[PDB]
Write a protein that binds this ligand. Structure first.
Ligand code: HEM
Ligand code: HEM
Ligand SMILES: CCN1c2c(F)ccc(F)c2C(N)=NC12CCN(C(=O)C1=CN=C(C#N)CC1)CC2
Ligand SMILES: CCN1c2c(F)ccc(F)c2C(N)=NC12CCN(C(=O)C1=CN=C(C#N)CC1)CC2
Ligand SMILES: C[C@H](O)[C@H](O)[C@@H]1CNc2nc(N)[nH]c(=O)c2N1
Ligand SMILES: C[C@H](O)[C@H](O)[C@@H]1CNc2nc(N)[nH]c(=O)c2N1
Lengths: 415, 415
């Protein structure tokens, strides 16, 4: 009928009907889309039809064993054997810890939108597949956070909860990411904190969470175990490391009173592997300066500090042609970079990050002739062509294992 | 078998075999590709099979008449009538000047990679469909250049040459764009001028053109009429307007001795309309600062002036983390912007350009529910998310009329 298109800046939606008048086979490309269904793995009422599960399981087990040098044919056949048996006896199966570890790295390895993949093999894996209660999820999450934070020297880690069984016993973190500041609709009409979390904030308020009406209040974990309703757990403040923003030259920068958390951790994605699905497996890497400096601090729909930094710098805030924005954003970026460095908190600039990826990609093509890459996400939000990845053509395809997006829980979940 | 992937920075090529292990239907996306076959319209040995031509012609004629308010049904039917007749009598047909004008604007209108489309209706159209000789093409081109340049106050224009008949009587400009600086492989091993034109430069040398071994030597027009070999015509220097680069603060900027031409004009694209094809129809708009400031002056494979500007600014050229590149590029951009303004030569900054497009797109959706847009090209090479189009999701599809790319002539042409 038509295609929905959204502008994440103004929120506005548009209906496209023109593509119907398109020509032959051009490569309606849905690449500019944030959350396309092709990248989402949703709900389920019943187990995974054995006819499907078994083949995938086999492939996976073949990938795993085909991995290490100097094969283990016997172990391989036996595993292939043991796995089939377990499936026709249980209607599913359990991966060996090693398979898990292998799975999570390869999934990371196949994340087309991840620019830090040269680190793919460095990943701590916490096995919480035996978790059973919400409170137990909380403890696990707290442990993850403490380990990954490591007092500023960030470590990449992922904690894997129980796999989806029937489809109505899903463990799931309702949060987008582990640490995230709340956004409130103030009474005077203004918005305080992160405007991007307005709804989810309300959701937490609706679940009995007490708002602190601040600019940087760390939201609570909203966990749901097995299938039960979600329970709210506040994050122990001693566990949330932060960096206060300051510029190495403009002493008025700190007057802005900005800061950001040091831990970037995905909370709501799904890990598909060998037919198995893990609807709850939070993971983290470390930050790239521009995420905070450009996206978090300069997006219109976020903290939007660009004009304020402009005026303070004495720029011509009323003349786009003056390129005052290009100037301000660069200083905000140096502040972020500077502040993290001064406080000994791992971070990387987008230039070294870009080169890093290029080396990864070339290593990746040699080792296995390819590397799924989504240019639209790999090119930084500033200084695009000043970066190597901008001039690199790339193919974006979905392999397996893979980290998928999922439909927001509060939408498809009955209490 | 595999897909070829190129890095326009190092020139290196890579073969991708992994996509074969892809999953279901994700939206191997070939969006990161510069010149995909889907966007190219190539050669032909014989006329256009009437079975194909006729239907397209009808559609087009229906688009044209369905255009203006208060229809002209009689004229429409008659035109539909007259056109069919002409086709079964000639094996082709001629568009009325108006249809041409309508065609070229709609083609511009359907250019997914053009950011200046809010200007789509402002286009001067020179009708050279009666051209017959190379020298005649030259005169026409000179006229175009003089009109468009307009002493700095740039005007958008397109000159349409004779349509492809049999397929072996193609009028074609061998140049990428009308004005373009030559790049020479110097004897001492270094490269002078625009390294991007090294081959084409050689081609001109091979055609009897005398190299001037400079940094900014305007290359000659290499025209081919009907089907004959290409003839070389040098461009009258009085016709090539230039802007010498200078910074509004660093007086040493001009010491760099940089300059660029004021006229951005496409020379090698094809105009498809109603089954008809025009393999030669150069057109021009005006510049967006970043094209010169970022691409032309800072690409590694181009003039590559980034480090030099860095040192002169006193930056930490040996520490990526210092973000010295983000600083230099911004000053280069202001120089370009400043220099064009000071010399009264039309130009637009990428911010006003970005807003301009957003307004176009919204107007476009209301008027005809859609606007083909290629995000990868619409987002500037710097300050991406500081721009509105970065947050706008968009669909990229090929309509008609349309401006296609073509296979480089020197590859498929016999002397
Ligand atoms: C070692 C440090 C790492 C760095 C520097 C890094 C950096 C990044 C950055 C900059 C993005 C873009 C975020 C955005 O634009 O919103 C991203 C996306 C992504 N990363 Fe990484 N990453 C790292 C580790 C990991 C790990 C350990 C995993 C998983 C095991 C991972 C999985 C992903 C996925 C799936 C995405 C896409 C997320 C989405 O679509 O929202 N990354 N990463
Ligand atoms: C009024 C001024 C105009 C401006 C400001 C403008 C600007 C631009 C810019 C900045 C690009 C990107 C170039 C690059 O990244 O290499 C572009 C591409 C394009 N423009 Fe426009 N344009 C204008 C007029 C036109 C006109 C008059 C036509 C045709 C009738 C046109 C057709 C196209 C096409 C086909 C492309 C894609 C070219 C390619 O794929 O290489 N533009 N334009
Ligand atoms: C997911 C992408 N992403 C990563 C990831 F998957 C894995 C490992 C990482 F190190 C990162 C990272 N370096 N940033 C985020 C994106 C920024 N994110 C946030 O906290 C967000 C803050 N505000 C947002 C908004 N609107 C979105 C995300 C942290 C994870
Ligand atoms: C085509 C895209 N393009 C336009 C276009 F189609 C139509 C109208 C325009 F105003 C522009 C424009 N504003 N720049 C170029 C791209 C830059 N180009 C050049 O001269 C190039 C210089 N160096 C290059 C390299 N390598 C490529 C192009 C001028 C036309
Ligand atoms: C609409 C557009 O896809 C979206 O705003 C962008 C594009 N590319 C991105 N790139 C990264 N790395 N992260 C993002 O959030 C986005 N968002
Ligand atoms: C490989 C990549 O597609 C290429 O280097 C880019 C991307 N987007 C672009 N965007 C514009 N406007 N112009 C360009 O030359 C390019 N080139």
């Amino acid at each position: 009928q038509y295609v929905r298109i959204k502008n994440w800046g103004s929120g506005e939606i548009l209906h496209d009907t023109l593509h119907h008048k398109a020509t032959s086979d051009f490569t309606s490309c849905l690449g500019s889309i944030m959350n396309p269904k092709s990248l989402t793995r949703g709900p389920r009422d019943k187990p995974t039809p054995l006819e499907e599960l078994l083949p995938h399981a086999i492939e996976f087990i073949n990938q795993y064993y085909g991995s290490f040098k100097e094969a283990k044919i016997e172990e391989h056949l036996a595993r292939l054997e043991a796995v089939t048996k377990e499936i026709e006896t249980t209607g599913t199966y359990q991966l060996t810890l090693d398979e898990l570890i292998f799975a999570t790295k390869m999934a990371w390895r196949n994340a087309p939108r991840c620019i830090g993949r040269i680190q793919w093999s460095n990943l701590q894996v916490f096995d919480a597949r035996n978790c059973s209660t919400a409170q137990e999820m909380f403890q696990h999450i707290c442990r993850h956070i403490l380990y990954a934070t490591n007092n500023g020297n960030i470590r990449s880690a992922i904690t894997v909860f129980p796999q989806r069984s029937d489809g109505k016993h899903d463990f799931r973190l309702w949060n987008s990411q582990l640490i995230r500041y709340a956004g409130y609709q103030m009474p005077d009409g203004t918005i305080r904190g992160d405007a991007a979390t307005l709804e989810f904030t309300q959701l937490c308020i609706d679940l009995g969470w007490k708002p602190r009406y601040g600019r940087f209040d760390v939201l609570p974990l909203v966990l749901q175990a097995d299938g039960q309703d979600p329970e709210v757990f506040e994050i122990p403040p001693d566990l949330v490391l932060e960096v206060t923003m300051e510029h190495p030259k403009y002493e008025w920068f700190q007057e802005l009173g900005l800061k950001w958390y040091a831990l970037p951790a995905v909370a709501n994605m799904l890990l598909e592997v060998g037919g198995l699905e893990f609807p709850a497996c939070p993971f983290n890497g470390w930050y790239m300066g521009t995420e905070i400096g450009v996206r978090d601090f300069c997006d219109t729909q976020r903290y939007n500090i660009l004009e304020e930094v402009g005026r303070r710098m004495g720029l011509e805030t009323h003349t786009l042609a003056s390129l005052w924005k290009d100037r301000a954003v660069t200083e905000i970026n140096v502040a972020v970079l500077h502040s993290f460095q001064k406080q000994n908190v791992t971070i990387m600039d987008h230039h070294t990050a870009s080169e890093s990826f290029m080396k990864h990609m070339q290593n990746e093509y040699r080792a296995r002739g390819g590397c799924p890459a989504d240019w639209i996400w790999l090119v930084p939000p500033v200084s695009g062509s000043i970066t190597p990845v901008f001039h690199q053509e790339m193919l974006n395809y979905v392999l397996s294992p893979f980290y998928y997006y999922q439909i927001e829980p509060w939408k498809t979940h009955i209490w």
